[PDB]
Amino acid sequence: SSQIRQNYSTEVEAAVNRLVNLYLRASYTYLSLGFYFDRDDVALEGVCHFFRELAEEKREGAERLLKMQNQRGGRALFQDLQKPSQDEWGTTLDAMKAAIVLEKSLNQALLDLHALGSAQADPHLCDFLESHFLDEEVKLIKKMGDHLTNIQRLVGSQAGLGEYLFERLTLKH
Amino acid sequence: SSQIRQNYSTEVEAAVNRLVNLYLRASYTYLSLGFYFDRDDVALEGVCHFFRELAEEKREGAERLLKMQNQRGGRALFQDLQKPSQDEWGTTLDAMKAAIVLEKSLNQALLDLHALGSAQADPHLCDFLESHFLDEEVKLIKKMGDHLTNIQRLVGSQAGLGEYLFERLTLKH
Amino acid sequence: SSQIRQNYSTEVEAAVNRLVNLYLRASYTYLSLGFYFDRDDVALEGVCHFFRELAEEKREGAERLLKMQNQRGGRALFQDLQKPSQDEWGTTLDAMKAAIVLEKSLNQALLDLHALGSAQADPHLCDFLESHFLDEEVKLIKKMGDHLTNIQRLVGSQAGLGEYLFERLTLKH
Amino acid sequence: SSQIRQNYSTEVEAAVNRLVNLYLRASYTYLSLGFYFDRDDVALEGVCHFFRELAEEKREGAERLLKMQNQRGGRALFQDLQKPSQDEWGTTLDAMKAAIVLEKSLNQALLDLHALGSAQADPHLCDFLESHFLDEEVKLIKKMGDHLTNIQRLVGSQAGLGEYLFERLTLKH
Ligand SMILES: [Au+]
Ligand SMILES: [Au+]
Ligand SMILES: [Au+]
Ligand SMILES: [Au+]
Ligand SMILES: [Au+]
Ligand SMILES: [Au+]
Ligand SMILES: [Au+]
Ligand SMILES: [Au+]
Ligand SMILES: [Cl-]
Ligand SMILES: [Cl-]
Ligand SMILES: [Cl-]
Ligand SMILES: [Cl-]
């Protein structure tokens, strides 16, 4: 094994790699969500970047996990990326729910890995997640919640008009 | 014939001139569309420039075709410009459909001329269309598609209110 | 089908999607190659970015293909991404060969798609590849060839010392 | 005892002081390593600063521990500093191994102190180590690993020439 490796469990090594996959899968889902909203028959530019900036961020989470894996003396193993769960994503509201659900899944994987870190007494891993992931994921889920409430409130009245306003007035383009 | 002319078919020369007419007719349609939306009883400033910047662009396509005709040793022949197909253009939605249809017609004329170029083995003509027209026309038709989807979605709910918002929030003024 | 779609074959639509997969797979291979060279027991910073800037570029090819798919009125379908072909990538020389091979495969897929475009008489697609992919891929394969020759020449003499010099003096960090 | 002291165990107080000694001993080792490489018969300027900037950093760790000790209401007790383990440090490779070993020892002392913090329920101490030491030590050990791999690879071929290149091309001066 590695010349540098110290207090780094094979369990955590393996779980970090699983987390890289989850983050890359999420990035790929957000690409699919992104380009869906760029379809001529959907055409909500604002929604399209929202999900495309999110694709960038999850790819950055996975790249951060990989950097760390190497820093600890673990060995990145890449697995197949399954495709996003859907080919069409519905309304902005349908999409934003799916994202929340996606993000809650990533968050739980994060919490599952803290718990493993604590069980393994790996304080660098705990710190790593606390500094770079836990806080950013809580903030993101909140913002998605906030979007969900606004979209729900708008599209309850007039669906399509509600969709347009939200994209125009909340989301950037 | 011309001192410069080389690999330039009479077929393509003639088809280039037909294309100039089509581009000038389109420019004239976009002028009519433009000033229609500046009527006091229509008054959608945003829609008015959208079509007026498009009148400029098609006049620029025809001027570009004419420059090229001369560059190849062809001889520009101008024909009568028939007037736009309508005197009143309806709603923003009616207007934007007509534009798509107009632009699809121009696009097909472009594709018809590539095919002629290939048949004639005129690689400068093919290149000319690829560099200055094909890509710009695809991008434009997409944007019109995108506008159509947004207008449809808005005016399905509340027609007039939908028209106002689109003009205010999507189109520039 | 789409309101914008014009001269866009289902064959090309499908082949564009296959090309997105190939570009995403390549991006994923270059991530694996990248982080391999960041291992403490490999530690060639220069090689690591070379492959990481390449991961970025192929993700940009796939994003460009997706933008276009939408511009034409096609519908992006995403498939599973198979994992990179190897878990360990050997020497810089082993790695750089694999990249050439990867890039030649992408290039052939590109050439296969031009040919399809020509068969379908889709001049926007041909242009699209010519402008954004064909030239960039030829330039890249050349540079990889150039690296291969330099690495071969260095490591023939002294392997490890040759590897260090190449990374230090040719590649950036 | 102190007017400020709160949730601060005598165990941790004592262990913090032991950690100050370890950091000062390390600083002193890096001074000895530093000036060894400045000998006229060794003369690797690059290696000399590498170890001298490290002497500064460990003195900064100990000063940071002392500031904290005071912040918590502990009382710094200083003990004798034993001299570095060697008078001559061999090659760059011999030196860089010794450093890794030194740094791994400091790292384990850090991990031993987190564990004590957790046992004592001292969350400020845990945080303190996580924020200022754990991450910096992991990053440093990685870089030493990376240097070790490069030095090994160079000096396997030609020892002295390998030493010169590494100092010239990796290390700063
Ligand atoms: Au922990
Ligand atoms: Au944790
Ligand atoms: Au041609
Ligand atoms: Au053509
Ligand atoms: Au073609
Ligand atoms: Au082609
Ligand atoms: Au604690
Ligand atoms: Au801790
Ligand atoms: Cl923790
Ligand atoms: Cl051509
Ligand atoms: Cl072509
Ligand atoms: Cl903690």
UniProtKB/Swiss-Prot annotation, chains A, B, C, D:
<dbReference type="InterPro" id="IPR009078">
    <property type="entry name" value="Ferritin-like_SF"/>
</dbReference>
<dbReference type="GO" id="GO:0008198">
    <property type="term" value="F:ferrous iron binding"/>
</dbReference>
<dbReference type="GO" id="GO:0008199">
    <property type="term" value="F:ferric iron binding"/>
</dbReference>
<dbReference type="GO" id="GO:0006826">
    <property type="term" value="P:iron ion transport"/>
</dbReference>
<keyword id="KW-0458">Lysosome</keyword>
<comment type="subunit">
    <text>Oligomer of 24 subunits. There are two types of subunits: L (light) chain and H (heavy) chain. The major chain can be light or heavy, depending on the species and tissue type. The functional molecule forms a roughly spherical shell with a diameter of 12 nm and contains a central cavity into which the insoluble mineral iron core is deposited. Interacts with NCOA4.</text>
</comment>
<dbReference type="GO" id="GO:0044754">
    <property type="term" value="C:autolysosome"/>
</dbReference>
<keyword id="KW-0408">Iron</keyword>
<keyword id="KW-0007">Acetylation</keyword>
<feature type="modified residue" description="N-acetylserine">
    <location>
        <position position="1"/>
    </location>
</feature>
<feature type="binding site">
    <location>
        <position position="60"/>
    </location>
    <ligand>
        <name>Fe cation</name>
    </ligand>
</feature>
<dbReference type="InterPro" id="IPR009040">
    <property type="entry name" value="Ferritin-like_diiron"/>
</dbReference>
<feature type="domain" description="Ferritin-like diiron">
    <location>
        <begin position="6"/>
        <end position="155"/>
    </location>
</feature>
<keyword id="KW-0479">Metal-binding</keyword>
<dbReference type="GO" id="GO:0005776">
    <property type="term" value="C:autophagosome"/>
</dbReference>
<protein>
    <recommendedName>
        <fullName>Ferritin light chain</fullName>
    </recommendedName>
</protein>
<comment type="function">
    <text>Stores iron in a soluble, non-toxic, readily available form. Important for iron homeostasis. Iron is taken up in the ferrous form and deposited as ferric hydroxides after oxidation. Also plays a role in delivery of iron to cells. Mediates iron uptake in capsule cells of the developing kidney. Delivery to lysosomes by the cargo receptor NCOA4 for autophagic degradation and release or iron.</text>
</comment>
<keyword id="KW-0968">Cytoplasmic vesicle</keyword>
<keyword id="KW-0409">Iron storage</keyword>
<feature type="binding site">
    <location>
        <position position="57"/>
    </location>
    <ligand>
        <name>Fe cation</name>
    </ligand>
</feature>
<dbReference type="GO" id="GO:0070288">
    <property type="term" value="C:ferritin complex"/>
</dbReference>
<dbReference type="Pfam" id="PF00210">
    <property type="entry name" value="Ferritin"/>
</dbReference>
<feature type="binding site">
    <location>
        <position position="63"/>
    </location>
    <ligand>
        <name>Fe cation</name>
    </ligand>
</feature>
<comment type="similarity">
    <text>Belongs to the ferritin family.</text>
</comment>
<keyword id="KW-0963">Cytoplasm</keyword>
<feature type="binding site">
    <location>
        <position position="53"/>
    </location>
    <ligand>
        <name>Fe cation</name>
    </ligand>
</feature>
<dbReference type="InterPro" id="IPR014034">
    <property type="entry name" value="Ferritin_CS"/>
</dbReference>
<feature type="binding site">
    <location>
        <position position="56"/>
    </location>
    <ligand>
        <name>Fe cation</name>
    </ligand>
</feature>
<dbReference type="GO" id="GO:0005737">
    <property type="term" value="C:cytoplasm"/>
</dbReference>
<dbReference type="GO" id="GO:0005506">
    <property type="term" value="F:iron ion binding"/>
</dbReference>
<feature type="region of interest" description="Catalytic site for iron oxidation">
    <location>
        <begin position="53"/>
        <end position="60"/>
    </location>
</feature>
<dbReference type="InterPro" id="IPR012347">
    <property type="entry name" value="Ferritin-like"/>
</dbReference>
<dbReference type="GO" id="GO:0006879">
    <property type="term" value="P:intracellular iron ion homeostasis"/>
</dbReference>
<dbReference type="InterPro" id="IPR001519">
    <property type="entry name" value="Ferritin"/>
</dbReference>
<dbReference type="InterPro" id="IPR008331">
    <property type="entry name" value="Ferritin_DPS_dom"/>
</dbReference>
<dbReference type="GO" id="GO:0031410">
    <property type="term" value="C:cytoplasmic vesicle"/>
</dbReference>
